[PDB]
Symmetry: D6
């Protein structure tokens, strides 16, 4: 059964490959450059950063993805949800199950009022999937991210604790 576990230091190599894949680092709007020692040092810096929850999406003792509950605001009770599924493990529905695991973690464990995610406006399939899981289209960010030579708009979607607990 697919599960979320803490992103451990020994796992960083996996993250390393994800952080240097331009296609992967386009879904998140991140520059696809990170030396392994740079990633290690940043991980060490954020070991005790409580604003973050970094998860390995694991299936059968296998690292299939990375789920991050970042920018966790403990007064406003909101967190940004981000997800990457390794392309070798795509097509198994791991994205939706990991998203639901992260939603349960933020709403049930972290006691968050709001979860929000940011996807590319071109990625209409992701918007439809997140709407199927319960996310509502909250807004559109115009020219928010410079990706592969062009300014891309983003769809920010959100879900709330009451709507999640009711469903």
């Amino acid at each position: 059964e697919l599960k979320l576990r803490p992103l451990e230091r020994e796992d960083l190599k996996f993250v390393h490959e994800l952080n240097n894949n331009a296609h992967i680092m386009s879904y998140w709007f991140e520059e696809p450059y990170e030396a392994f020692v740079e990633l290690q040092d940043l991980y060490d810096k954020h070991i005790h950063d409580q604003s973050e929850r970094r998860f390995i999406v694991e299936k059968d003792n296998e690292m299939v993805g990375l789920v991050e509950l970042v920018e966790i605001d403990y007064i406003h009770r909101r967190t940004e949800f981000q997800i990457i599924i390794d392309p070798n493990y795509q097509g198994y529905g791991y994205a939706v199950d990991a998203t639901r695991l992260a939603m349960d973690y933020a709403f049930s464990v972290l006691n968050m009022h709001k979860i929000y995610l940011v996807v590319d406006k071109e990625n209409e399939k992701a918007v439809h999937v997140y709407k199927k899981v319960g996310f509502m289209v909250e807004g559109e960010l115009i020219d928010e991210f410079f990706v592969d030579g062009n300014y891309h708009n983003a769809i920010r979607m959100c879900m709330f604790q009451k709507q999640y607990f009711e469903n």
Copy 2:
């Protein structure tokens, strides 16, 4: 003539009074608590943080406001604009002039593609002022901030470099 200057350490006392005023710290969605030594230490921590531009809005050698260009992203070329006008200096049009100087700084000095701000949805006066200065309503954040016992939505507004260069 209204001017922007760097927020100096010796000015922090002024900022202190703004950072512990609940009414002032409601426009920004900040908890109205900051010990002076806490503000001083955080200021020292961000002395060389290039993601930030902290400005004293000065009129006739007197500190009338605080303008911040924060979260300066140098790849996506966007920055969050924040403004506080001292309540004793409100009603002089200082807000619009300081906003125009901050826009000029981000677009002309920092070479930013996008400026964005976050205001309260109830704050119709600020929304009108920002629309007059060139900001467009970009989106609405639902239950984004817990303010004075209730979850408030926010209006995120944005302006772009081309529209600024048009004027």
Copy 3:
């Protein structure tokens, strides 16, 4: 008008005098010993401790008390409320007003679900004051604190955010 402001380093001398008063440090179950440099160094240690909110209770620009929202849990959304009124300022209703300001701060600003306090069972006056503001007797801690040669029981009282906002 009675107000709460952040406990500043420059105020510590006042706190010092409160922290070495055995009668005052009996209301809280604290050992009435603290060298001034010890208190200063502990304050410096907790400058950026977000589990704490230390307040000078100020009336007419004069330090009349100390209110602390400590053990701030941001997942369970509860905090311990503690209050001291300087004996020179007792009888002015400062205790009830400072308690109400701290309750409003924890429930409306900090978005806390629960406030709890712990008083001595002998202190029926404080129990009455806390019942007047809305606190409910939550439980009894048997022989919880060693005070002046004897094991004293304590009354733990609590209030919740919904009941506070209703009244």
Copy 4:
């Protein structure tokens, strides 16, 4: 013979597995997230913390559980008792034997006047077992812990040194 030994650094992997089990980290009211390096760093930080006694519950040279005497107050002579039995080693009475060993340690070695524990109110079996071991129901904490999406009340139970030495 079942024994308690100090929680060693080399044992932390065991602790790691317990600290990310949501079911296990629900009896203790702890968020079930801890990277292994985070647990290691916290353990190193608390090596010389005398407020703590961390025990591996060992049976036949095997780590079967974790017993913690935390919040050891040396003036009020009380400590919080917490226990975890690995789910694969449950049903052998290890919980009761480890509880009796920890009580003997706190009362006879640490010279504690009082031991207290906090269990979930739903866990009536644990309350009954601890009452059989000598613990008295001390109080109820209302909505004290946010567990798996709901606010749970807790039962705080206590035992005293005189009653322990008499039996």
Copy 5:
């Protein structure tokens, strides 16, 4: 009225004068040498040393003595009591009042089971006074301290918490 207050850093000069008087530093079996910066640094190193309670014996806002509850063992619940009265303030019974205050502090505040002190065997007056205040002669240490060219025996006296509360 004579009181005990924490030994503050600003008081150290007073202690300095006492720590370099050979006659005074004979009652305690201490070498009468301590540079002011040495005493200051040792005080700073032990600011957070909980094994110690250093008191200025104060009468009418004047430093008349120094009382130390050192070697505070929190498992065996015992502490060594030491006292110095400034020779300029001797003959006012300040020693007995400060001793009674320190006894009350160790037994009632620190919850100590035992207080012990060590005096010179030649100082029969101190032994008689401590018997009057409640101390029991516990034993004699042979050639325990080298004082002014000769090995002196010491009288170790003790008092207990139950007998203190009875008297």
Copy 6:
């Protein structure tokens, strides 16, 4: 397919031999001396230096070159491009492909307005090739670099984001 990846610490051995090859370190105007530990320490010092992007040019999991986007100015949005191809990997057209990969990275990922490079004026082959890829001869630096006993002039060439995206 030839690719760019981050220059990893484990790759530094490769770089070491390139940094001590006088012929190679003549194309760049660098002194051909660097102890391996010196290179390691400088790499560690610049791990989080965002002014730099150091790339291993990799072909079939083999280190064939080094591409550096250095002096990345995020206000003027320009960066200096430098490239080395390993001499045993010369003649494979790796230089032009790595140059196009670096151009795409600086213009499309880093959102640079301008790329500039510096070659020796004697190196007409590089000027011809860089003109073929789109670089324009921007200027000539007279006696700019002391190489192998003589002051050499350099050709500085530049390319811009609009002309790159059009082609």
Copy 7:
């Protein structure tokens, strides 16, 4: 008589006023933002940086300007010359005298082979002045600097040690 002296820490306030003048900090292509503590920290960091020589241009014991010999390469024997004259001291020919003093220092003291400077292409008057002192236009940098909302070209001019000593 106009002289060059080392830029002392005590002089930094003067530099501060120059570093936040947008018009002044436009001739040099520097962002016109620097908190005083930021400038102070950068000065302290570069106290022992031998790549730079920072000079106060002093006339009659008055700080009239700032001359910097930066990017001093000791293998290629070149340095960048930069100059600012305080606007209240412009029109006295201080710029030319300070420039000649700086060239004499770089060529005669630092034994530099080459001096280069960078001015705005719009500033044709400065180019003519530098030609009058002996500088030759070395090259033009296309869209090199983002100044006041537009990409500006720069004129890089250079002078050499032999031609300087001949004149």
Copy 8:
């Protein structure tokens, strides 16, 4: 032949086992808890502590005990002698021979005037053995140590340099 050697870091594991045996840690009146890293860290802290001499009692290349000359006072010329024999090596007279080796070390090497030890008052056999080796019963400490739930008195015994040199 039984010998004393310095307690080395590599030996600490052995000490670890002795430090976690409650029966062993009853002869010394020490809490039988010490994590291995805690013991290691304390050993590292006391590497250059000249107040102590920690000895492995070795017989036939085997660690059979631990002898400590602690609290070495170099003015009063006294030291506390403590000894532990591993339970697997009891019955060989190792305790008495190691005690005599430690006596010779303190009197002949350390030039101590006095050695003192502390045993439990119930352990009359140890008192008689130490009287056989030359120790004299010096005094009795009432309720000095809390051991296994009860306050135990201790017998402090002493030996002096002159009588030891005579024997």
Copy 9:
């Protein structure tokens, strides 16, 4: 009355004047060079150095000399005695009185078995004086110290604890 007190940091200027007097620094065999900050730093370095006891020889609240008990060996129970009397206070017998005070301190307080001093062979008057106070000529060191261009022999004299206590 002439007394010895600890050499305080604020006194170092006095010591400074003594340490740069070539004539004074010939009696001790010290190079007569010490910057004031050098002396201060060494004093700070040896604040907690128990191998030395540095004394201001004070007469009528005036610094008249410097007495040092250095190289205090606590196993061999010996220390080197050195004394300087300020030349402006010579002829008052301060040297002999300070020597007797230092002897009493080393023998009676520090429990030293032996005191030794080293004087120049030319100073037969000091040898006679020290023999009057009780020191015996112990030996002669040939060419031990290079003083003012020549190797001088030294007389090492010693005194013992038994002979001191008898006289």
Copy 10:
């Protein structure tokens, strides 16, 4: 291909054996003592010392010598040349080849104006060899170095950049 490469940390053992050979350390006027960790620590300390260029003279993947360009003055443009050839590799002309390579490095790469070396006057063969290589006898240092119990004079020889480039 006799070559110079950077002196790497891994090579230090080789240097170690050269640094403790009294005969080898007579050509250089160095004390023939250096612990391996001392050499390592000094090497690490001078990793980023630009006044130094330490070279392993390597022939056929074998360390045959050590060439040092030390005291590199970048203003006066001079450096001291030192060379050691391992005695097992003497007689192959390695000294002359390494000397010429070092001359080419200082004059052509480091752009040095002057090279100087210091040899023993007794070593007339080396002076003759360096004159054959192009070095001119610059001067004689009288009693400059204490070598094997006697004061030895040295011959300082020099070469200049113009004469080197002419030949």
Copy 11:
């Protein structure tokens, strides 16, 4: 009477004025640039550098010069002598008196075998003066120092301990 005293930190301002006078900093071959904080930091770094002896040449409590015994080699027993007399105090014979004092210090105090100095060849007067005080012309360094735009040769002069002591 003219004297030498240690160069104190408080004197550095004087040194500062000397260190930025090009004419003064030509006799010593030093670059005439040193910020006051740079000089202070270098002074602090070399406080405990025993290779150096920095002297203020003082006449009637006034700083008239600076004498340095640098590069003190304690095995070869040689030191470089450098002297500066402030031009306002030149012509009083202060130079020769300070030189004689420095020679006496190096030969009689520091036990140096050799003193050497380096002057410019143009300064034949300095060579004659040093020959009058006892210095011997030891050698000539060709193009040793780049001063005011030209390579100057230097005269190195030396004096010895035996020749100094013979008179």
Copy 12:
């Protein structure tokens, strides 16, 4: 051939065995206690301590002894010589050969004027051996060292550079 080499860190184990042999460490007047980590830490502390020269006496690639030239005074040019020969390698004349090697090192390499050693007065054989090697009995130190329960006098012997060079 017997040789001296630097005492390396990897050799410390050997030294360790010598430093805990009571008989060996009595000839030197050292307490025979040193933990291996203590010896390692002191060795690391004195790596760059120029006051000492620690030598392994090596015979046939084997550590047969330890020779120390300690307390090296570079002003008075004297050093203390100490030697230990491993008891398994005594009777080969290693002591005399190592002593002559150390004498040659101190006199010829370190340029010492004086060597001194200190032996026990009972060791008439060592005094005779050192007189045969050239040492002269310089003096006798009364009760200088406490060894094995008794105060031992010592014979200090010395040799000078001229007498050594004559022989």
